[PDB]
Design a protein around this ligand. Structure first.
Ligand code: AG2
Ligand code: AG2
Ligand code: AG2
Lengths: 113, 48, 50, 113, 46, 113
């Protein structure tokens, strides 16, 4: 996940090493050569600024495109369940083709201004 | 009035990051992915 | 009135509340989200204690 | 889990959206139609209030009744392992009959008065 | 201090333990007790 | 995981009951009579004190010696991936021979002096 009301999506700040960062994340690890794995993260931002944002994560044996499409829909569904009006959904995804043993990871890190 | 004790209150920013990496072990691959995403040197407290 | 228990390590929680809920969902995570909402704790960040 | 010493069991307070809430929880997700799933939580309270309470969680493919009985016994065992005097055990449970994809969830949320 | 100063953890302690248990969670609780951190709330870091 | 820069490895402090302690840990549970299970933790310390330490955890159906050797190697690898000069690696390990149902656990508890 939940983005606090009035919080802003910002580029990753300069984090102090060792910081205890509240983070929502999705990840997938695979040891199958040639397998494509992906992880994605999304955040549904409400029109009503008094409400909170909903963070969703996804991982799976699929493409970067499919992972992002899926996670965005998951965030939208969360807002549907709440009956909240949508401003926009921001998301990012990553894919990895396993050579020997790989990991795909996506996260939403909560921090301070 | 400039806010004090801001770090003791609720987080007010969210950043989306992502990365991937190979690794000799699952944990080393995970670590590599975090490093690739830019958050490899902080402690992740998983929120659910 | 806000507090980050991970930073204010010197201020321990002094209350405990039991909640429970269930829900169907289009995905495992949406079902989980639904269950939290049903339990009355769907709009907060749960820091799992172990 | 651990209920801090002197903590009071109270109905869930109004929580600020996005709050970071320390929570002990059990959950189970099933995609098997007609399957009954349950989750339960228990809190063993000590007679000596200077001592902490013990929170236990449980989830499984069983009834709400079985889940609660099991989680209560788990909290009782924890006090027996410590050799502490048990005052009582507060518990809650929930069961869900899966239609297509369902989740049963039970939790002990630690907060402030 | 009269004004709480925000800080990151400055101590790290290595502990270990093991234990039998009637259930997985009770065995885990017993292991934490044997390790010396059975009566605190662990916030798992990843 | 991550040991903050300037943090010190010290014997477990007196922790208030119920404290929310950030902890990196590895554990394994088994119900196979006679089976040996182990858990281990390692902390790679940097030569450059401006950098952070790396905490690694390992668990498996093996001996204490194998678990500790593996987890120390994992920390070394982490430092190699970062290209940081390694000062030394501190670790701890434990093994348990299951009677009926047992758990082996190893952790690095982060706190404040
Ligand atoms: N409502 C929650 N706190 N969690 C479930 C929805 C968010 C999943 N990242
Ligand atoms: N003693 C602990 N902190 N944990 C072990 C028991 C956990 C039950 N939720
Ligand atoms: N870099 C992290 N925060 N995590 C991955 C490496 C440490 C795993 N205990």
């Amino acid at each position: 996940x939940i983005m606090p009301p009035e919080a802003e999506i910002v580029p990753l700040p300069k984090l102090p090493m060792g910081a205890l960062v509240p983070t929502a994340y999705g990840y997938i690890i695979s040891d199958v050569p040639g397998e494509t794995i992906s992880a994605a993260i999304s955040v549904a931002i409400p029109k009503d600024k008094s409400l909170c944002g909903l963070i969703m994560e996804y991982e799976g044996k699929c493409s970067k495109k499919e992972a992002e499409k899926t996670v965005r829909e998951m965030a939208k569904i969360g807002f549907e369940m709440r009956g909240w009006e949508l401003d926009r959904i921001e998301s990012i995804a990553v894919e990895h083709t396993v050579e020997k043993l790989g990991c795909a990871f996506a996260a939403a890190a909560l921090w301070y201004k | 009035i400039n806010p004090l004790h801001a770090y003791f209150k609720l987080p007010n920013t969210v950043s989306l990051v992502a990365g991937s990496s190979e690794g000799e072990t699952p944990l080393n691959a995970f670590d590599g992915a975090l490093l690739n995403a830019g958050i490899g040197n902080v402690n992740l407290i998983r929120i659910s």
